[PDB]
Design a binder for this molecule. Sequence first.
Ligand SMILES: *[C@@H]1O[C@H](CO)[C@@H](O[C@@H]2O[C@H](CO)[C@@H](O)[C@H](O)[C@H]2NC(C)=O)[C@H](O)[C@H]1NC(C)=O
Ligand SMILES: *[C@@H]1O[C@H](CO)[C@@H](O[C@@H]2O[C@H](CO)[C@@H](O)[C@H](O)[C@H]2NC(C)=O)[C@H](O)[C@H]1NC(C)=O
Ligand SMILES: *[C@@H]1O[C@H](CO)[C@@H](O[C@@H]2O[C@H](CO)[C@@H](O)[C@H](O)[C@H]2NC(C)=O)[C@H](O)[C@H]1NC(C)=O
Ligand SMILES: *[C@@H]1O[C@H](CO)[C@@H](O[C@@H]2O[C@H](CO)[C@@H](O)[C@H](O)[C@H]2NC(C)=O)[C@H](O)[C@H]1NC(C)=O
Ligand SMILES: CCCCCCCCCCCCCCCCCC(=O)O
Ligand SMILES: CCCCCCCCCCCCCCCCCC(=O)O
Ligand SMILES: *CC(=O)N1CN(C(=O)C*)CN(C(=O)C*)C1
Ligand SMILES: *[C@@H]1O[C@H](CO)[C@@H](O)[C@H](O)[C@H]1NC(C)=O
Ligand SMILES: *[C@@H]1O[C@H](CO)[C@@H](O)[C@H](O)[C@H]1NC(C)=O
Ligand SMILES: *[C@@H]1O[C@H](CO)[C@@H](O)[C@H](O)[C@H]1NC(C)=O
Ligand SMILES: *[C@@H]1O[C@H](CO)[C@@H](O)[C@H](O)[C@H]1NC(C)=O
Ligand SMILES: *[C@@H]1O[C@H](CO)[C@@H](O)[C@H](O)[C@H]1NC(C)=O
Ligand SMILES: *Cc1nc(C*)nc(C*)n1
Lengths: 13, 14, 296, 50, 291, 50, 50
Amino acid sequence: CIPLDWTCMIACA
Amino acid sequence: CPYVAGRXTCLXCA
Amino acid sequence: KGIYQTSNFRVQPTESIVRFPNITNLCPFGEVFNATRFASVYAWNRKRISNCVADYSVLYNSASFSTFKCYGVSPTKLNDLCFTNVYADSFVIRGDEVRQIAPGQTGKIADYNYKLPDDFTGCVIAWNSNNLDSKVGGNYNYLYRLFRKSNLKPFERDISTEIYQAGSTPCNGVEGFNCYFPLQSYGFQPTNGVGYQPYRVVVLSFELLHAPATVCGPKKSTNLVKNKCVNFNFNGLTGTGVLTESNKKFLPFQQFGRDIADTTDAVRDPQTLEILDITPCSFGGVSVITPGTNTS
Amino acid sequence: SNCVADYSVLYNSASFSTFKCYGVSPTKLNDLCFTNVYADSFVIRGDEVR
Amino acid sequence: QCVNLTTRTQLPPAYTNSFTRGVYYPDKVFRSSVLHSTQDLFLPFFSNVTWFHAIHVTKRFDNPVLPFNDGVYFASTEKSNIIRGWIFGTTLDSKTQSLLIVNNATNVVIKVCEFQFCNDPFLGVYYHKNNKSWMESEFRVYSSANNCTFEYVSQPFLMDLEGKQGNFKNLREFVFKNIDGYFKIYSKHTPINLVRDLPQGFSALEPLVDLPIGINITRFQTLLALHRSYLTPGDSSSGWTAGAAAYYVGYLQPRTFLLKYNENGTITDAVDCALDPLSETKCTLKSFTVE
Amino acid sequence: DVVNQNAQALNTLVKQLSSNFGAISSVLNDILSRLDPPEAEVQIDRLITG
Amino acid sequence: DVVNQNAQALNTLVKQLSSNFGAISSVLNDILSRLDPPEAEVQIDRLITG
Ligand SMILES: *[C@@H]1O[C@H](CO)[C@@H](O[C@@H]2O[C@H](CO)[C@@H](O)[C@H](O)[C@H]2NC(C)=O)[C@H](O)[C@H]1NC(C)=O
Ligand SMILES: *[C@@H]1O[C@H](CO)[C@@H](O[C@@H]2O[C@H](CO)[C@@H](O)[C@H](O)[C@H]2NC(C)=O)[C@H](O)[C@H]1NC(C)=O
Ligand SMILES: *[C@@H]1O[C@H](CO)[C@@H](O[C@@H]2O[C@H](CO)[C@@H](O)[C@H](O)[C@H]2NC(C)=O)[C@H](O)[C@H]1NC(C)=O
Ligand SMILES: *[C@@H]1O[C@H](CO)[C@@H](O[C@@H]2O[C@H](CO)[C@@H](O)[C@H](O)[C@H]2NC(C)=O)[C@H](O)[C@H]1NC(C)=O
Ligand SMILES: CCCCCCCCCCCCCCCCCC(=O)O
Ligand SMILES: CCCCCCCCCCCCCCCCCC(=O)O
Ligand SMILES: *CC(=O)N1CN(C(=O)C*)CN(C(=O)C*)C1
Ligand SMILES: *[C@@H]1O[C@H](CO)[C@@H](O)[C@H](O)[C@H]1NC(C)=O
Ligand SMILES: *[C@@H]1O[C@H](CO)[C@@H](O)[C@H](O)[C@H]1NC(C)=O
Ligand SMILES: *[C@@H]1O[C@H](CO)[C@@H](O)[C@H](O)[C@H]1NC(C)=O
Ligand SMILES: *[C@@H]1O[C@H](CO)[C@@H](O)[C@H](O)[C@H]1NC(C)=O
Ligand SMILES: *[C@@H]1O[C@H](CO)[C@@H](O)[C@H](O)[C@H]1NC(C)=O
Ligand SMILES: *Cc1nc(C*)nc(C*)n1
């Protein structure tokens, strides 16, 4: 998984 | 009792 | 004789449309209201409720509630709505303190253990649990906070066990004279009078009609018809209008769109995630031209 | 008269089943002062508390 | 295990200007082509915000315990992913509950526990010369965690740990609120290219998560990651270097803002109506232009 | 100025439909979707007066 | 008469602040020091409308 940013993974359970 | 009377969560135990 | 303004041209709706999300499972009524263990009121448990049908009529077989009071919503409207950000708070208190589970209450529970906000939206459910939480010789496993330096904030939980200083001399972390453990045990016996019998309390909190929802009432969804005057029901939001396809692009956290008059003019359909404009059916001025009714 | 209405001392022993205030919110009682205080006390049966 | 870092060069605190930053979406309602007035906890326009540094030339590693007040605007300018998360609580020891949000280079871990936090909490990346790999090596933020009620681990991801140099490439903005037992987080990530300061511009922060934590928060502390290699010799308290990063802290207060929604529903401009009489005139005229 | 004043008065009338007037919402459908006819009557009477 | 009428209108506006408008008091501070924000909202909304 390559996120757009790590901060968008805070709301990704 | 989890405690003796007057101690712990049994402070109000007469 | 003259010309007279009348009402604007009205179009009546032809059919009723219900659009709820694709939701199959039932809500965990057995897990919430029929749990084996309940939390203490100082360490009250909060459980998230999501992706389920709130068909509360399944509680009619097993459950009997002595208290059921809703605040931001009428009880007879609960089947027609969808609920946003649902949480269930569960704890055990004595019978005399059930009245303290309400907004704007004082007392030791409402001050030191569990506090509801002033603008609380949701329902408070309580029922007697003497046969489950009382035992011969006394059940002392349920605790409450008797001592605190200040009142709790709404929906705040305090599970600290520091020694309370009830006098002038410091405690230095040990018990003694005017130095008490802040948590005290309820004494629940089956021969206690009502008022000192244990009551299980479930507090449901939710938001309504402002956001995407995933907990819904047991309403069946119809088909989506467009370009006609209909009565609609989008996730609990009712109304009358004509639904057309929209060019608006909603952000993923948005469910409804509003205009300058704060009326809902756009909605995302919960099954097919398209944006639909909402337009009122009635439009256009009408005048009648007459001679005298004594003439014709 | 001439006393501090610190009702939190009742939290140890009292356990009321009815507490209803009329001209005042119960959360405002700690911040107020009271003019002509009288306490009326009697005993009735439980059906007549309403 | 807790390590108290040494060899930090002492500097006076720095300050800068948050020009029009910190505006977030106040609700979840779509609006378009409208000027909408709302009252909420906003960072005021042209406010005096505190400037913190992580740099090694001088040597800075700024993770002080800061007050929370009524809400925090947090903005960080990074290139090598140095800011990893934050600590929220009151006493920040085992007597009270605290909220942990942290990126440990693979997941985002959100925990609400009675942490016995370290006096100098940090994360650690170690650089290998033999196969040129930067690896997550240390996690030294707490010594114990007991009696705890909220746990959340995110989906796994891949994040670059290389301590790059040059200009700052990422601007990450946050608004933290703690209202009625809910921890509300708003966020916005924009790509940037600048040297030292907080950029001037407008970007509306979108809602991220509402955490039902139910704890008292008065103080907060930023978690940073340091770098260790052969270029940094010594023990655990001295043998380290800091990658280049900076972060900015502002405070929210009740304000009335006039938000501009464009044709596509994006908040593109705002007026802080209590800033000056000209902005108050803009607010009462419901217009960004005054004749 | 005559044309602008008439247009401004009509647009002010349109914009004043978002006033709550002391009710829980300025939206009739939002009130009627959540409340039974008695409390709905209370809120709607507030909106009608405003 | 012009001066007297304008002075009388402003003084009447000042004197009309003592009207209760159906609320329990005409004093915002007396309402706020006795009631919590839910019923205080009802009384203050009555005073605001008046
Ligand atoms: C609530 O929980 C109790 C206990 O788990 C359930 O009682 C069980 O019911 C089944 C079938 O009726 C019996 O076979 C078990 O022996 C019962 N267990 C006990 C301990 O009595 C009860 O059915 C549950 N009620 C609901 C509505 O789920
Ligand atoms: C939230 O935490 C703060 C900080 O611990 C609490 O403020 C303290 O309150 C006590 C008693 O009221 C005082 O003796 C301290 O001096 C206060 N400290 C500070 C730094 O303000 C506050 O009471 C807590 N909030 C709640 C609702 O318990
Ligand atoms: C890091 O520094 C802190 C404070 O400078 C140390 O905390 C002190 O530890 C001593 C011994 O355990 C105590 O007597 C003090 O009361 C502590 N002070 C505070 C403010 O907590 C800590 O031990 C140091 N850590 C290491 C690993 O050396
Ligand atoms: C970052 O934290 C997460 C959560 O604590 C770690 O994921 C767990 O790692 C342990 C140890 O390998 C496993 O037993 C668990 O099954 C993992 N849980 C999940 C949900 O993945 C993760 O390993 C940490 N990463 C680093 C680099 O420290
Ligand atoms: C298991 C938790 C379900 C939560 C559903 C939340 C949305 C619905 C809110 C109202 C739920 C009704 C509660 C039970 C009502 C019982 C009625 C009665 O017996 O008088
Ligand atoms: C002994 C007479 C005291 C007179 C006090 C004057 C008025 C002050 C407020 C009245 C408080 C009455 C007791 C409230 C107890 C609340 C505890 C509970 O809710 O269980
Ligand atoms: C990389 C990954 O897992 N995802 C899924 N997302 C979730 O929110 C779960 C969205 N995303 C982001 O990078 C924000 C991609
Ligand atoms: C809901 O179900 C329908 C089939 O009844 C399907 O076509 C639609 O894509 C679903 N919507 C979702 C899963 O969001
Ligand atoms: C910002 O605050 C600091 C500390 O109060 C002060 O020294 C500095 O002058 C302030 N800057 C401005 C521009 O007001
Ligand atoms: C080589 O890289 C791997 C992972 O990239 C690392 O675990 C290992 O320690 C490295 N080799 C040496 C000798 O350090
Ligand atoms: C907190 O944890 C300690 C040890 O883990 C335990 O002794 C104590 O009872 C706990 N307090 C609670 C659960 O309130
Ligand atoms: C709005 O979106 C459309 C297409 O989605 C685009 O062509 C247009 O430029 C956008 N407008 C603005 C102001 O960004
Ligand atoms: C057995 C017992 N235990 C407690 C805590 N209290 C009483 C009165 N009795």
